[PDB]
Design a protein around this ligand. Structure first.
Ligand SMILES: CC(C)(C)c1ccc(CNc2nc3[nH]c(CN4CCOCC4)cc(=O)n3n2)cc1
Lengths: 323, 342
C-alpha cells in the first residue's frame, strides 16, 4: 500500500502499531522491526470486528504473528471507547498505550512538515501542484482536521497547541447527505459525480437573485421552489441530477469549512492553514475549493496547504510516542 | 401584523414598500392618516398571486388610488422584478428602488429606536425577555456596535458601528434555502412550518454522531450530548436523477423524517450561530441581531442560535430576535419613500 522510507528507532526491539480510531475510519501507522519503512492503512470502524481482524492480519503478516513483541498505541476517540476492548481482543500483546487525539495530530503534522520530503503541497486549478520544501516561517499555523466533523487546532510553537474551534459540518455530513439523496455507495462515486456536476440547477447564484455571477447565494436554494384534491405527487415527483447535487453539497461543505478556517486564521493572526483528515483524498476539485476559499477571503494573504498523508496525522503522532 | 406609529403622510402619497428576496416578498405600508404600519409576506413563486396582493392592498387600503401610490422595491430581487412591477402598475405615481443593505439597516435601526416590545432575547431557561431599546432604559451606546445576521435563502451579515455607519462582512450560502431545499427533498415536508413541527418532535441522535458516540464520554470543552458530526451516522445502473420518491423508496423508513429535520435544523442554525460569533469576535461586537424569515418565533431555533452565541463567547455576546424580523428591508424602503413624500 502507501509506504515512506524513514530510519525509525527500533532500540526497543518492538513492533509499534499505531491506531487512530475515529467515529467512522480507523487509520494505522506501523514499521516492521528494522525495515526503515513507515506503512499506512485505512479501514471503516463500524463492524469493529472486521477492524480488530485487520490488526490481527498486520501482526500475522508484518511481525511474524508475534503479539509478545507488538505494542499497540491507540489515538482518536475510540482510544477510550475501545482501550479495554483492545486488551480483550489482544491478550498476549506486549502492551497498549494511549496518545491524546489533538497531541497526536500535531506531533504527526510536525513530523511530516520537518522530516518527510514531497509531503506538504499547495494545489489550485490555475498553478496545479507545488511541493513546499518544509523538510529542507512554519509557525504559527492552523490545522483544520476534516473527518466526520471538523477540529481546528492553533500551533504557535513546536509543543504549544490548543483546539480553537470546530464544526459538526464535516466529511460525515457530506457523505451522509449525498448517500441518502443519491444512493451513491462510495465517496469516489460522489466525487466522480460532483466532477461533472453543474450546481447551478440546485443552487441560487448571485445572478439568479439579481441579474461574480457564478457566486453561490444559497446552496440547494432552488430545490424547495381530509383528501379532496389531486395527490401532491407533482412535488414528490420533482427530479434533480445526482452530479449537480454532488457538486452543490461538495461546494457547500467545502466553502463553509474554508470560511470558518479563514475566520479562525483572522482571529489568531495566522497565515498558514493545513488541511488534514480523510476529506480531500487528493481530489483536485475539493483541494481547489478549499484553496480558493482561503485565497478569496484573504485576497491571497493566507495560504491553504495539503498533506500526502493527511489521514495519518494522528496515527503518526501516536507511533512516534512509542519512542 | 400591525404597529401603532404616528407617520408623516406629507403629500398623502401612499407608499407601498416591497422587499423581494429569493423566495419571499415582504410588504410594509400605512393607509393615509391611519398611524398604522401594516405588514404582509407572500411567496414570489406565483407571480399572479404576488401582483394580486399589491392590487388588493391599493384597493382596500388606498381606496383604489393608483395615481397616488408609490411602490419602492428593495432586496436582491428589486432589479429582477422591476419590469414585472412596471407592466402590472402602469397607472401608478411611481416605482423606485432602495439599496438592500441601507434598507435593512434603516429598517432595523428604526425598529430598535422607535418600536416597543420589538427586540427580545429567548432561551429555554430564561424564556422571552423584551429589551427596552426604544425607551431610553437600553439607550445611547449599549445599542452600538451591532451585527445584523439577515437569514433568507442565504445569510447576509452587516456591521453597524454608529448611526449611518454600516458595512457588509462575509455571509454564508448555508441559509434557510439550504435547510428548506434539503428537508423538502429528503423528507417530502410540504411547508417550512411542517419541517419545524417534525423537527420539534425529532431525535437528531439517530442520524448525528455526538461527542458521546465517538469519545464514549465527555471531552475539548464539549459535553457528551454535543454534536460532533451532523448526519455522521447516515453514511453507515448509471442513474442520473433523484427525487423524494426515489429517496423514500430506496431507504424506506431506515431514517425517520422528524430526526432528519431536527439534525439539519441544528446543523444550519449552529453553523449560522458560529459564523455570526466569528464575525462579532473579529469586529469586537457583543450585540447580534437575527433578521429575515428563518427564526419565525420558533422557540427551538431561537434557543439554538442563542446557545451557540452564548457558548462560543463564554457569555460575552448575546443573540437578539425581532418580532418583525422579516420586514427590516421593507421598513427601511418605506422610511425612504416616506421622507420623499414629505
Ligand atoms: C474530536 C472529536 C470528538 C472527534 C470531535 C470532532 C469534531 C467535532 C465537531 N463539532 C463541534 N466542534 C466544536 N467545537 C466547538 C469549539 N469550542 C471551543 C471552546 O471549547 C469548547 C469547544 C464548539 C462546538 O459546538 N463544536 N461542535 C466535535 C468533536
Amino acid at each position: 500500500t502507501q509506504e515512506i522510507s524513514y530510519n525509525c528507532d527500533y532500540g526497543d526491539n518492538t513492533f509499534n502499531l499505531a491506531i487512530d480510531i475515529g467515529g467512522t475510519l480507523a487509520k494505522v501507522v506501523f514499521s516492521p522491526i528494522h525495515s526503515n519503512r513507515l506503512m499506512f492503512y485505512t479501514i471503516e470502524t463500524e463492524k469493529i470486528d472486521k477492524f480488530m481482524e485487520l490488526l490481527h492480519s498486520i501482526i500475522k503478516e508484518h511481525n511474524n504473528g508475534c503479539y509478545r513483541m507488538t505494542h499497540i498505541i491507540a489515538t482518536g476517540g475510540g482510544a477510550f471507547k475501545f482501550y479495554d476492548l483492545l486488551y480483550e481482543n489482544f491478550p498476549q500483546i506486549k502492551g497498549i498505550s494511549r496518545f491524546e487525539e489533538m497531541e497526536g495530530l500535531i506531533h504527526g503534522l510536525d513530523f511530516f512538515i520537518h522530516e518527510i520530503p514531497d509531503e506538504v503541497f499547495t494545489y489550485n486549478d490555475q498553478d496545479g501542484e507545488r511541493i513546499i520544501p518544509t523538510s529542507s516561517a512554519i509557525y504559527p499555523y492552523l490545522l483544520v482536521n476534516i473527518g466526520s466533523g471538523v477540529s481546528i487546532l492553533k500551533v504557535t510553537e513546536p509543543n504549544n497547541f490548543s483546539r480553537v474551534g470546530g464544526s459538526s459540518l464535516g466529511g460525515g455530513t457530506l457523505w451522509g447527505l449525498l448517500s441518502l439523496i443519491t444512493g451513491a455507495q462510495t465517496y469516489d462515486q460522489m466525487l466522480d459525480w460532483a466532477q461533472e456536476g453543474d450546481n447551478s440547477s440546485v443552487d441560487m447564484l448571485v445572478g439568479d437573485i439579481y441579474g461574480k455571477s457564478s457566486a453561490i447565494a444559497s446552496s440547494f436554494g432552488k430545490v424547495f421552489q381530509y383528501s379532496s384534491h389531486e395527490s401532491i405527487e407533482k412535488n414528490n415527483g420533482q427530479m434533480f441530477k445526482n452530479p449537480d447535487i454532488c457538486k452543490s453539497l461538495l461546494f457547500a461543505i467545502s466553502n463553509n469549512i474554508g470560511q470558518i478556517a479563514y475566520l479562525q486564521a483572522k482571529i489568531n493572526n495566522i497565515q498558514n492553514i493545513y488541511f488534514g483528515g480523510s476529506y480531500t483524498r487528493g481530489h483536485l476539485t475539493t483541494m481547489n475549493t478549499l484553496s480558493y476559499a482561503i485565497n478569496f477571503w484573504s485576497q491571497g494573504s493566507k495560504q491553504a496547504f495539503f498533506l500526502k498523508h493527511e489521514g495519518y496525522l494522528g496515527a503518526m503522532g501516536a507511533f512516534l510516542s512509542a519512542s
